User: Fold human IgG1 Fc K248E,T437R mutant from Homo sapiens.
Amino acid sequence: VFLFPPKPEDTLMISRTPEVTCVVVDVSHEDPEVKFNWYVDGVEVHNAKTKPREEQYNSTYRVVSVLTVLHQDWLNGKEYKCKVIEKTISKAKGQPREPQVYTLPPSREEMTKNQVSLTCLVKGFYPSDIAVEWESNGQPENNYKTTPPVLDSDGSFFLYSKLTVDKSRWQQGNVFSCSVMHEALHNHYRQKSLSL
Amino acid sequence: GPSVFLFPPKPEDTLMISRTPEVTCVVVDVSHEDPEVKFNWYVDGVEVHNAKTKPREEQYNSTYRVVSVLTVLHQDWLNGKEYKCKVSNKALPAPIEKTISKAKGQPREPQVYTLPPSREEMTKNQVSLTCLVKGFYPSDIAVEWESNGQPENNYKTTPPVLDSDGSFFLYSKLTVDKSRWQQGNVFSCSVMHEALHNHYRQKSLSL
Ligand SMILES: *[C@@H]1O[C@H](CO[C@@H]2O[C@@H](C)[C@@H](O)[C@@H](O)[C@@H]2O)[C@@H](O[C@@H]2O[C@H](CO)[C@@H](O[C@@H]3O[C@H](CO[C@H]4O[C@H](CO)[C@@H](O)[C@H](O)[C@@H]4O[C@@H]4O[C@H](CO)[C@@H](O)[C@H](O)[C@H]4NC(C)=O)[C@@H](O)[C@H](O[C@H]4O[C@H](CO)[C@@H](O)[C@H](O)[C@@H]4O[C@@H]4O[C@H](CO)[C@@H](O)[C@H](O)[C@H]4NC(C)=O)[C@@H]3O)[C@H](O)[C@H]2NC(C)=O)[C@H](O)[C@H]1NC(C)=O
Ligand SMILES: *[C@@H]1O[C@H](CO[C@@H]2O[C@@H](C)[C@@H](O)[C@@H](O)[C@@H]2O)[C@@H](O[C@@H]2O[C@H](CO)[C@@H](O[C@@H]3O[C@H](CO[C@H]4O[C@H](CO)[C@@H](O)[C@H](O)[C@@H]4O[C@@H]4O[C@H](CO)[C@@H](O)[C@H](O)[C@H]4NC(C)=O)[C@@H](O)[C@H](O[C@H]4O[C@H](CO)[C@@H](O)[C@H](O)[C@@H]4O)[C@@H]3O)[C@H](O)[C@H]2NC(C)=O)[C@H](O)[C@H]1NC(C)=O
Assistant:
């Protein structure tokens, strides 16, 4: 039994739906039926949905149960238990740290190419639950990738977000904004601009 | 009962000719009534007998951990030689065969860009040096920092991220004191990849 936490961006963005996943493995053919009992801080709920079983290569079934949760509950540190084996996960306990957002312009050597990369460094935050978005002139970007949180030496986490845009746009003096959402932020939001 | 895990050699060991690459075969969940584990290594079918097996290791969950290490050649691993680890045990119905090799696919040369600290970060006593490595394949890579010949220690590298063009990218952040950066010292970002010239690429960064 494995109890996975909701996606970091799903617990911050109200437009998405955070889910707690309970993956059960090594299920026997003699006993395929698996009963799931979810508990939110003790109180038993019944709004969980179970996905159809999938036979693995090692002749075992893989039963997965999904429980949709609220954004406020997880952020406040609600205790979620999965009774199959009784696993239990929750929000990362510990003193929250404010992230430091730094936007970085493309390297001079990258100007030789047709497309440049915009860098947004976010460091010194806790916990690792975070969401990063890019936007330009109000309209959001789509061609960007963000690295998973990395545990730094001081106990906090950090990551990077790379936006790829045409060199023409960057040379025309356009303004790109790096949006960061985190628990220990004012209004759970911080933004930094970047232009030539 | 017992499970077998075959680990690939360190990326920097297969590229640096001074280091020694080795394929590790880790066996867990070994019964106390049968700690006898047989290892059989095969290189593209041909069985080798130069492996070095370490004695058993008692774990906290009342199980043993037998580890077999096989040193390999740099040219062999890079050419895509297939390495097989046959594990035999009395508690096993049939010998378990795990098999690993170099990640198949056409190699791509990584592009290394060093980025100076932000202006806002200059307020702090510790600034961050950024190294961007993008457009490489496969994900097997190694990144290191150095200054004045001597290597740095206070840095961290993000795991490779699959980009939109099918290639991988990552970042490496070096944390130095602002006094060093303002003194005019030079910091270099060392990158080791199989698609690079002499499997090495380095870019410098200074104020
Ligand atoms: C009894 O205890 C032992 C020992 O565990 C220890 O004791 C217990 C009591 C606890 O306290 C533990 O916290 C403690 O560690 C248990 O043995 C464990 O068994 C599990 C499996 O059930 C193993 O998990 C695997 O881990 C590997 C990665 O292992 C590296 O990283 C670990 C930290 O992340 C580290 O602890 C390991 O030592 C090892 O470290 C690496 O070592 C090599 C060489 O030694 C070195 O070169 C590396 O640099 C170094 N790396 C690091 C980070 O240190 C993980 O890869 C495995 O994932 C595979 O298997 C999964 C299914 O189990 C699957 O989901 C994955 O996708 C992946 O599957 C493979 O994927 C590859 C592609 O990548 C594919 O090619 C393969 O075909 C595919 N194979 C399969 C089978 O799917 C896996 O998660 C633990 O490592 C192991 N512990 C140790 C110390 O080895 C034992 O289970 C306990 N018994 C009971 C009954 O509970
Ligand atoms: C029969 O086969 C089953 C299926 O295994 C699969 O098929 C085989 C052929 C191989 O391809 C495997 O690679 C593959 O997984 C086995 O089930 C597996 O059991 C093992 C443990 O027994 C599980 O390993 C555990 O993995 C956790 C992380 O799992 C995520 O990441 C995986 C990739 O890294 C991904 O494959 C998983 O699906 C899962 O992905 C996440 O899913 C959630 C929910 O859907 C999402 O929210 C996330 O975003 C996903 N993340 C992604 C996509 O990156 C580890 O966390 C876990 O570690 C913990 O336990 C170990 C001990 O087991 C500790 O040492 C460790 O410290 C830590 O506490 C563990 O490694 C594996 O995930 C299971 N497979 C699947 C598909 O879930 C059966 O075990 C096997 N039966 C027998 C008898 O062998």
User: Anything to note?
Assistant: Residues 102-207 of chain B form a domain with the Immunoglobulin-like fold (CATH 2.60.40.10). The pocket of ligand 2 is lined by residues A 2, 4, 21, 23, 25-26, 56-58, 60 (CB under 6 Å).
